[PDB]
Design a protein around this ligand. Structure first.
Ligand SMILES: O=C(O)[C@@H](O)[C@@H](O)[C@H](O)[C@@H](O)COP(=O)(O)O
Ligand SMILES: O=C(O)[C@@H](O)[C@@H](O)[C@H](O)[C@@H](O)COP(=O)(O)O
Ligand SMILES: [Mg+2]
Ligand SMILES: [Mg+2]
Lengths: 213, 215
């Protein structure tokens, strides 16, 4: 089944803990959001992995250059997975992946904003096995909906051999759009953290995934 | 005008950054909180460095990719003067960051990398972005990529479009003459200053060379 990831896009650790104390056991992956990496730094990764060592911890660092250096910082803080932004030089992705392998971790390419199909082939050739198909929050706020072009791109990525994560303002009602595609992970940030009942929100995502897959 | 000099604090902790700033804060124009310091310490790095050096321009090299208003507000509330937005970001991310920047009398720069296009560059101008950072990736440099002709052409074209262009990416002193005759806004040095036997003398050599080349 597709896994469920919660995004902790919080500015401070104590704010993040308001969510994790409710739903850490209701999800498969705990993400240190980019917002939390910028708010608190990499201690957020170390602290969350110490609290939840049985969960996959994703550092959404969106590494853009100095791949081996930033990745080592994240993996020394006990991250399992780290993100590399799609426009990074290929050598950045390669360097981050080399370090990830030292720590028995992994790298995901974050498809946030503009990228090309040629770049996608380069990632595959480099040994990258995960991508995050992300509808930008700012694009969403400007009225951009999930649509057919996204579904065709996701399927194309999956067919290239990537394990694809889908994310970007997902609501429970969006999940059927992706039915029949072997999605690796769905991420929910706002729709879990900001729900009247975060526990019910997480359980509803899991129930719907179980029904659809 | 002479190109200004920016020091990049690509350090993992504040104390490591301070080993540099205590030597060269008054030897450079702009103090950059490097991306790895932003990720290493978080936005306290911006707050602390601006409190130490309130008369200097402080740049947060956050390379914002999405959530432009949220991340830019975090940096500007920490008293940044300038923030970076990565070139692949949705145009609404750049616009959101810029709108916040204006509230704080700050500014945004687009960090150039990847396969950005000239049409995107026009989008940034149309959105009111006035600064770009022409950056040779550190990882590309390590893979043998040199500064060269296509870079000069692109830098000149960005300048002609109306951007103030910053040049950066493993610059050494000997690289500066490559850019002579172009109205470069800022040169950034990270490693060439921080890792010098004498960071003060390295900064001063950059300044002397700039003064000759653009004098
Ligand atoms: O770009 C960012 O850093 C976040 O907007 C993004 O990574 C976020 O973590 C999403 O992937 C999930 O959060 P939402 O479900 O609230 O969009
Ligand atoms: O991508 C990064 O975060 C840095 O590699 C980059 O921004 C760096 O700060 C350079 O602009 C200046 O540092 P060097 O002179 O050491 O390349
Ligand atoms: Mg995220
Ligand atoms: Mg930098």
């Amino acid at each position: 089944l597709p896994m469920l990831q919660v995004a902790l896009d919080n500015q401070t650790m104590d704010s993040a803990y308001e969510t994790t104390r409710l739903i850490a056991e209701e999800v498969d992956i705990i993400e240190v959001g980019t917002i939390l990496c910028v708010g608190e730094g990499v201690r957020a990764v170390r602290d969350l992995k110490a609290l939840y060592p049985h969960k996959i911890v994703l550092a959404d660092a969106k590494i853009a250059d100095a791949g081996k250096i930033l990745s080592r910082m994240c993996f020394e803080a006990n991250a399992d997975w780290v993100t590399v932004i799609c426009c990074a030089d290929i050598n950045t992705a390669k360097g981050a992946l080399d370090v990830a392998k030292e720590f028995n971790g992994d790298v995901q390419i974050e498809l946030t904003g503009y990228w090309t199909w040629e770049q996608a082939q380069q990632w595959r050739d480099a040994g990258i096995g995960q991508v995050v198909y992300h509808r930008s929050r700012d694009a969403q706020a400007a009225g951009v909906a999930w649509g057919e072009a996204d579904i065709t791109a996701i399927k194309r990525l999956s067919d290239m051999g990537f394990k694809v994560t889908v994310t970007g303002g997902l609501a429970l009602e969006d999940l059927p759009l992706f039915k029949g595609i072997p999605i690796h992970v769905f991420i929910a940030g706002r729709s879990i953290r900001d729900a009247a009942s975060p526990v019910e929100a997480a359980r509803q995502f899991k129930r719907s995934i179980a029904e659809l897959w």
